[PDB]
Amino acid sequence: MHVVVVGGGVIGLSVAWQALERGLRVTVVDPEPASKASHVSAGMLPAAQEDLLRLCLASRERYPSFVKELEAVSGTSAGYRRDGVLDAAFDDESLAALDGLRNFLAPLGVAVAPLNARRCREHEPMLAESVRGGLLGPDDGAVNPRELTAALLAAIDVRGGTLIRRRATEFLATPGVLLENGCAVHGDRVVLSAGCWTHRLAGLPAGAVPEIAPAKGQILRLRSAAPFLRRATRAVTGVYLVPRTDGELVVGATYEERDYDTTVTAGGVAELLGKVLAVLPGAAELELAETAAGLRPGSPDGLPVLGWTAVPNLLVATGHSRIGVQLAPITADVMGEMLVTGRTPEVAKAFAVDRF
Amino acid sequence: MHVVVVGGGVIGLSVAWQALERGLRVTVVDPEPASKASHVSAGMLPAANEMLYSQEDLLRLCLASRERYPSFVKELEAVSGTSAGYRRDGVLDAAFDDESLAALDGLRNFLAPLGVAVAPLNARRCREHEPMLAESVRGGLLGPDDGAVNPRELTAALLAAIDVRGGTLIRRRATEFLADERTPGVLLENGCAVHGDRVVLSAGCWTHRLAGLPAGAVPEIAPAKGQILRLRSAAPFLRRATRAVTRGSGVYLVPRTDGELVVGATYEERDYDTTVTAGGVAELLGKVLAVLPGAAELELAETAAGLRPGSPDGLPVLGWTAVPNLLVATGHSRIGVQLAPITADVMGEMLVTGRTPEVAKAFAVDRF
Ligand SMILES: Cc1cc2nc3c(=O)[nH]c(=O)nc-3n(C[C@H](O)[C@H](O)[C@H](O)COP(=O)(O)OP(=O)(O)OC[C@H]3O[C@@H](n4cnc5c(N)ncnc54)[C@H](O)[C@@H]3O)c2cc1C
Ligand SMILES: Cc1cc2nc3c(=O)[nH]c(=O)nc-3n(C[C@H](O)[C@H](O)[C@H](O)COP(=O)(O)OP(=O)(O)OC[C@H]3O[C@@H](n4cnc5c(N)ncnc54)[C@H](O)[C@@H]3O)c2cc1C
């Protein structure tokens, strides 16, 4: 059977890859794959709503083997680091949220080591002395989404998946899509995973797909020749600080309701620099190498949108908002199953399209 | 006669242009003209400031350049058929606390004797001239006859003009000064040589680093790093070149006609480093958003960093060296765009007459 995946960010690429891994034939339609939210994304993979939590822990459990399998097929690196994740808090408010977080994670078998202010500074010398304590998640990490999507693209190629670099301009009642150049592509199944543009595809029957509203996020990248920070760090007052091996240090992110605007603004960059310098005062001399902005794919109730629509053979896989890099593997596994079996794995039932 | 100008930022391009205008033949040596401090520069053309209070000679140099700027630009656009991006809509000096409002009183008294139009403005009048100022504005001064230039457009014109008048541009690095010959010259990185009747060094903070210079000839032109940024809106955000002071620190806000808004600048001692840093950009954004809170929505379009050419005593270095037929024209530090015209006029005279105009005597090389 043949599945057409509309949109090729981290969510359609992963989905398309796993569909191939399950012996399906796959076409991905996207004029510029891995160019949007997935391009600017930080790739923090923090452990962290019961249903969503369960979805995240499953994706978490799966991440290591997902990456292993992907590198094997692709002969490429996905840039997955498992050096643990440091949660650092700097005031009463934030130190209390850590207690809540640690209590939320103990029952579920997630390694979480509480750290007092001192222990925090020993794990990360570059933290400001105002640090009040933290949590260490030694089994967690972070990925470089740019490397992850590059691998997904390589793997999809190796397995003979087709990539069409054109815009899907219309959905056709088997299902298919019209492309901007006039050519058409039908398949046995169609999967929409076009981020915050999913619901904007002309020809979708009213009510089929809910509004995947964009949530803007500005983000920046600093650099030093040698890495500045020891490991993926969350500093709460939340700012995400993700060191790459080559000296890049990602700093995200703003969360904003600005429709589809992706302008990098004085306000946003000032917000981010303010946070990083408050908790990493030595970051003052790091080079500001990049500033960017992307759109998170939302949903009317803030949770992912996975499974069948009321339109036969039309599925969706979107609305991962703040954590799609994190949810990418489980989403891929889940949609694989759905396509092959016709049934919806238990862990995904909460995110059916029909709930609206 | 033939003059070789080493270095082609705003100071050698202007100098070279005026030398041509005076019928000299001119060669400019610079691998990438107008690429350094002159590229990042804001182009504020302020009359005077706290810095000139205890510096009568420099003040006199600045006021002369100020007087000359309008006609300099007129003459340059005429020769070049190009715009230099000189705006004369006046300059707004805005203050935001007691400290800064008092410094304005001092500044207004400093400028009245020198024939500089300066209109005091109360907090209300400030907000009427510039609606985007924060409501904490405490009062200002308007300098209606002052303005600002876009250095990028100014150097483009200088380059066009120099071309039109048959000046030669050699896009190579001068690697060595050739001393002790009938005439002075420079060796280039590609091995070719260029002599002239006069040589003028105007290579910013690299001037003193040219191999072959006799010891003591040129003093240390030490770099002073400055980061600067550019914001943008489709329609202009700020009405005119604005200086805002608060909490004992200043920021320059220079609107261009196309919506670009320049915001400078940091002053830092980092030798020759021109890295744009988290610290520097945070400094600048902090200042602009404090006094222009609406600037939060503006696009951050560009960040940059440049090296100001300094001098052992902080004043320009103009005139002859102890090496015969070897002149210099550098060390303008924070205000070379402002001083560019007068510097050009002055060096023209020096080359043609052999004498040093009175206004420039204070900046002789030999003072060290
Ligand atoms: C600043 C920022 C930081 C983030 N940090 C993290 C983090 O640290 N950890 C984490 O887990 N998550 C993070 N996220 C979230 C995560 O990056 C996103 O949820 C995820 O990238 C969504 O993937 P997606 O493929 O659904 O959408 P996208 O990556 O936006 O991909 C959608 C694709 O659809 C395509 N498309 C659009 N219209 C059409 C059409 N008509 N035809 C064909 N194709 C089309 C586009 O070209 C695009 O490539 C972050 C997001 C942002 C904005
Ligand atoms: C951030 C910042 C903001 C500023 N804002 C203002 C302002 O608002 N108003 C104002 O008046 N001034 C301002 N200035 C000052 C102004 O930018 C400088 O004083 C002026 O640029 C000095 O220019 P210059 O031509 O001497 O040197 P530069 O512009 O540095 O030019 C020197 C040139 O020499 C060339 N060169 C170097 N070595 C060699 C070699 N061996 N052979 C050949 N060529 C060589 C270089 O390539 C370069 O093009 C600012 C400066 C900075 C850094």
Give the separation between CA A113 and CA A134, rounded to whole angstroms. 8
Cα A224 from chain centre: 25
3-class secondary structure, B246: strand
Give which of B334, B138, B153, B126 is closest to B242, Cα–Cα: B126
Chain pair A-B, CB pairs under 8 angstroms: 62
Distances (CA, A) of B332 to A121, A146, B151: 46, 45, 15
Could you tell me the two tokens for B368? 């060290």
Give which of A284, A218, A42 is closest to B286, Cα–Cα: A284
Sign of CA dihedral B308, B309, B311, B314: negative
- Judged by CB atoms closer than 8 Å, whether chains meet at B278 and A285 is answered as yes
Same domain, B3 and B67: yes
Same domain, A64 and A149: yes
Give which of A286, A211, A294 is closest to A247, Cα–Cα: A286
Give the separation between CA A78 and CA A148, rounded to whole angstroms. 4
Give the separation between CA A293 and CA A279, rounded to whole angstroms. 22
Pocket of ligand 2 (CB under 6 A): B 6-12, 29-38, 40-44, 173-174, 202-204, 206, 210, 226, 228, 252, 264-265, 306, 308-309, 330, 332-338
Q: Which of A269, A299, A329 is the last residue of a domain?
A: A299
Same domain, A262 and A354: no
Same domain, B235 and B368: no
Could you tell me the two tokens for B137? 């504005």
Give the separation between CA A55 and CA A324, rounded to whole angstroms. 11
Annotated ligand binding at B41? The verdict is: yes
Give the separation between CA A282 and CA B200, rounded to whole angstroms. 42
Same domain, A217 and A117: yes
Give B351-360's long-range contacts (Cβ < 8 A, gap of 24+).
Answer: B351/B1, B351/B3, B351/B19, B351/B22, B351/B24, B351/B198, B351/B200, B351/B327, B352/B22, B352/B24, B356/B319, B356/B320, B359/B60, B359/B61, B359/B64, B360/B61, B360/B318, B360/B319
Give which of A212, A179, A217, A180 is closest to A198, Cα–Cα: A212
Helix pair B10-21, B56-80: axis angle to 10 deg: 70
Give the separation between CA A45 and CA A113, rounded to whole angstroms. 17
Pocket of ligand 1 (CB under 6 A): A 6-12, 29-33, 35-38, 40-44, 167-168, 193-195, 197, 201, 217, 219, 240, 252-253, 294, 296-297, 318, 320-326
Give which of B75, B79, B330 is closest to B220, Cα–Cα: B330
Q: Fill in the amino acid letter for A4.
A: V
Full DSSP string of A121-178: HHH-TTS-TT--EEEEETT-EEE-HHHHHHHHHHHHHHTT-EEE-S-EEEEE---EEE
3-class secondary structure, A82: coil
- Residue with the two structure tokens 């009321």: A310
Q: How was this structure determined?
A: X-ray
Same domain, B57 and B25: yes
Distance linking the first and last C-alpha atoms of chain A: 30
Same domain, A43 and A70: yes
Distance linking the first and last C-alpha atoms of chain B: 30
Give the separation between CA B220 and CA B212, rounded to whole angstroms. 15
Annotated ligand binding at B280? The verdict is: no
Give which of A333, A328, A338, A336 is closest to A9, Cα–Cα: A328
Q: Name residues whose C-beta falls within 8 Å of residue B249's C-beta, 6 or more positions apart in sequence.
A: B287
Q: How far is A225 from chain B (nearest CA, A)?
A: 12
- Residue with the two structure tokens 């550098």: B330
In sequence order, the β-bridge partners of residue A177 are: A171, A185
Question: What count of other Cβ atoms lies within 10 Å of the Cβ of residue A17?
Answer: 30
Q: Which of B285, B311, B337 is the last residue of a domain?
A: B311
3-class secondary structure, B185: strand
Strand pairing report for A233-236 and A85-89: parallel
Give the separation between CA B33 and CA B12, rounded to whole angstroms. 9
Could you tell me the two tokens for A276? 């990083």
Full DSSP string of B141-183: EEETT-EEE-HHHHHHHHHHHHHHTT-EEE-S-EEEEE-SSSS
DSSP, res A302: S
Give which of A85, A39, A76 is closest to A236, Cα–Cα: A85
Same domain, A234 and A268: yes
Burial class (CB in 10 A: 0-12, 13-18, 19+), A181: exposed
Q: Name residues whose C-beta falls within 8 Å of residue B150's C-beta, 6 or more positions apart in sequence.
A: B43, B84, B85, B86, B256
Same domain, B367 and B320: yes
Q: A315 near A309, Cβ under 8 Å?
A: yes
Q: Which of B263, B291, B311 is the last residue of a domain?
A: B311
- Residue with the two structure tokens 């009213």: A206
Helix pair A145-158, A50-74: axis angle to 10 deg: 60
Could you tell me the two tokens for A245? 């091996």
Q: A173 near A187, Cβ under 8 Å?
A: no
3-class secondary structure, B303: strand
Which structural domain range is residue A350 located in?
1-81+140-211+300-356
- Judged by CB atoms closer than 8 Å, whether chains meet at A288 and B297 is answered as no
How many separate domains does chain B show? 2
**Ligand 1: residue whose CA is nearest its atom 4:** A41
3-class secondary structure, A308: strand
Give the separation between CA A320 and CA A304, rounded to whole angstroms. 5
Report chain B residues touching chain A, CB-CB < 8 A.
231, 275-279, 281-282, 285-286, 288-289, 295-300, 303
Same domain, B247 and B286: yes
Q: B285 near B229, Cβ under 8 Å?
A: yes
Same domain, A37 and A89: no
Beta strands in chain A (DSSP E): 2-6, 25-29, 44-45, 80-81, 85-89, 113-116, 133-137, 141-143, 162-164, 168-172, 176-179, 184-186, 189-192, 214-223, 233-236, 239-243, 248-252, 287-297, 305-308, 314-318
Q: What is the per-residue burial (b if ≥16 Cβ within 10 Å, else e) of A331-349?
A: bbbbbbbbbeeeebbebbe
Q: Which of B231, B282, B296 sits opposite A274 (nearest CB)?
A: B282
3-class secondary structure, A88: strand
CA of A258 to the centre of ligand 1 (A): 16
Q: How far is B3 from chain A (nearest CA, A)?
A: 40
- Judged by CB atoms closer than 8 Å, whether chains meet at A287 and B300 is answered as no
User: What are the backbone angles phi and psi of residue A277, rounded to the nearest 5°?
Assistant: -75, -30
Same domain, A161 and A248: no
**Reported structure resolution in angstroms:** 2.3
Q: Fill in the amino acid letter for B276.
A: V
